[PDB]
Design a protein around this ligand. Structure first.
Ligand SMILES: *[C@@H]1O[C@H](CO)[C@@H](O)[C@H](O)[C@H]1NC(C)=O
Ligand SMILES: *[C@@H]1O[C@H](CO)[C@@H](O)[C@H](O)[C@H]1NC(C)=O
Ligand SMILES: *[C@@H]1O[C@H](CO)[C@@H](O)[C@H](O)[C@H]1NC(C)=O
Ligand SMILES: *[C@@H]1O[C@H](CO)[C@@H](O)[C@H](O)[C@H]1NC(C)=O
Ligand SMILES: *[C@@H]1O[C@H](CO)[C@@H](O)[C@H](O)[C@H]1NC(C)=O
Lengths: 335, 333
């Protein structure tokens, strides 16, 4: 009996994990045995291979092969897939970031429309959902839109436009795919979360399809919002007639871990999973991979790590060790 | 003079160990020196390579290569092999769990029949025994049959069917292999042990061959049933005209070990081995690997470990340290 059995018993669609597949994880049989363990993982998100740079490496030149390999592996384990992501400021290919001729509103708009429409149409219902727009909101000032190539060239309309053309792809192909907005620092009440809610309100007002908000939940042990804080935040989103999902959960510590910070980690994993369990329209929890060996954390957040549910004391391709944080997740679904 | 010497001097067929071979353990020269030490280990069980997903990776397409490497290694140190296992709910290949069509009673009954018969026929007497059905009983409610693809699609008859077709292979090829049912939480009196005894009774009543019951004996220090509790439980099984074996013994602790919990571990290894020693038809003791470095426990139970007879304080590829629990096993023999 694992996290996915427990989540589905609570009415959730999955307990899930991201995976950096295709990639070196596939050569780690201890990793792959647990990735394939449907008791723990009934959902998954590709950590990289479905992003803009890998799926449209040159303008109008689409590449689906690595993404299809990820989907094939996920299907073999009966995992529902959160496809991720279409429009994002980061990890963009050079033909977008350094064009020989400046983009205009017209020409970048068509780039955006083509990428969104092609990816959603091509993969169809192999995706449970798409993260259509990723991290459109700024941290400073918290409420505002973040400056990026899409916003600077198209204006704030680029967000509605992405969902509009994702909806066109779903209707033109009679798809069931859910359309999500996904962001971080929107897991607690505050200007950024309220701004995300306003995005949902404005799309709903324009009759543009939006089905859910993804709450990334990249947290630091002891800074994570309390369970009660996440419960009320989730309610604010779901009151707008949408689902939410915890989409990229990990709880990083300042290295090295100690007894106190490890206890904080268990508490913070518990609080996040418990808030989702308490929320009727939180459809699931996905961790941003489950094995410290392959976690993105040390590279993105200097001096931090130990953020996942398992680790390998002897490195890649050696046995996993289940952390107490795992039991925090399990207890949150049982309680 | 080691555990297998002592067990064989007491009339047992072996003291044994599981090993996850082929695999990482083969690259640890200190692990393999002790694995190959027939003074300690005269029996062995493959932890994974003989399971369904490795031996029939696609339908009717068998792969015996990994299993034969294990058997060859076992043969090199004169080990009797408990082949493990034929029919089990877990770790089935995606052609069984995610099929195009949906299985029916008939099409699954033939998958089961085919898997059991060709595996038993192919390996013949390279196997001392087969765990023909593994863990067919539920924990909740304890007495009941476990729900799985076999039980759901075929019904409870799938257990008798698996032994029937294993018996067909031993009859056709005149084999000596023993047919075992293997389960956990049947090492003490209770609804689940009674349910396992009822399986034996049912098979015997229908003239279907069943030679033994495997008592997995995955225990927690301090929760292990007393030696006397195991002695009665074993007697309930052997009274049905079968053997028993302690098949997957380990005694895990909440980390870190302390003086009390380690003394409990020694006492619990002693109790289990002594109960087998006291039981005429308990044919041997197998531990579920012998080196903490490679034990299944830490991947499965958070904050638990230290379950095995040896460990490596300095990690893989460094010398083993023999734990007090080893002397408990030896004293019981
Ligand atoms: C996990 O599943 C994938 C997809 O079928 C497979 O390629 C891989 O070998 C599996 N790894 C295991 C079971 O360790
Ligand atoms: C498409 O991607 C695959 C793997 O992701 C790569 O091997 C191949 O070269 C790519 N083809 C292109 C970009 O035309
Ligand atoms: C554990 O780490 C935290 C974060 O660096 C620190 O505040 C705390 O003092 C540490 N506890 C110890 C070293 O006992
Ligand atoms: C253990 O025995 C096997 C089988 O003959 C052999 O491959 C391996 O090298 C041995 N290792 C030792 C004795 O350390
Ligand atoms: C030893 O560990 C056990 C199991 O966690 C615990 O109950 C007991 O208090 C410990 N005894 C010590 C530390 O002396």
């Amino acid at each position: 009996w694992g996290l996915n059995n427990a989540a589905r018993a609570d009415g959730k669609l999955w307990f899930g994990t991201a995976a950096d597949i295709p990639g070196l994880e596939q050569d780690d049989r201890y990793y792959m045995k647990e990735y394939n363990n449907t008791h723990d993982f009934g959902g998954t998100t590709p950590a990289n291979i479905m992003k803009f740079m890998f799926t449209e490496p040159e303008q109008n030149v689409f590449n689906f092969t690595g993404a299809q390999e990820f989907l094939d592996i996920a299907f073999a384990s009966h995992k529902l897939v959160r496809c991720h992501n279409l429009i994002w400021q980061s990890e963009l290919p050079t033909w977008v970031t350094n064009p020989t001729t400046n983009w205009t509103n017209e020409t970048l708009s068509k780039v955006l429309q083509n990428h969104v429409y092609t990816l959603v149409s091509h993969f169809g219902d192999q995706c449970y959902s798409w993260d259509v727009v990723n991290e459109a909101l700024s941290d400073d000032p918290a409420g505002s839109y973040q400056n990026n190539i899409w916003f600077d060239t198209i204006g704030p309309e680029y967000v509605a436009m992405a969902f509009e053309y994702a909806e066109k792809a779903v209707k033109d192909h009679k798809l069931n795919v859910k359309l999500y907005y996904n962001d971080y620092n929107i897991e607690y009440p505050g200007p950024k979360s309220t701004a995300a809610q306003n995005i949902v309100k404005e799309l709903k007002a324009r009759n543009i399809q939006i089905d859910g908000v993804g709450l990334e939940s990249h947290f630091i042990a002891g800074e994570t919002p309390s369970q009660a804080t996440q419960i009320t935040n989730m309610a604010d989103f779901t009151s707008l007639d949408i689902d939410v999902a915890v989409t990229e959960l990990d709880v990083r510590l300042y290295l090295p871990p100690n007894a106190t910070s490890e206890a904080q980690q268990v508490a913070d994993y518990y609080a996040t999973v418990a808030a989702c369990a308490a929320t009727e329209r939180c459809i699931g929890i996905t961790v941003w991979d489950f094995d410290d060996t392959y976690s993105w954390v040390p590279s993105t957040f200097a001096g931090q790590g130990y953020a996942d549910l398992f680790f390998q004391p002897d490195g890649p391709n050696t046995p996993l060790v289940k952390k107490a944080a795992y039991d925090g997740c399990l207890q949150a679904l049982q309680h």
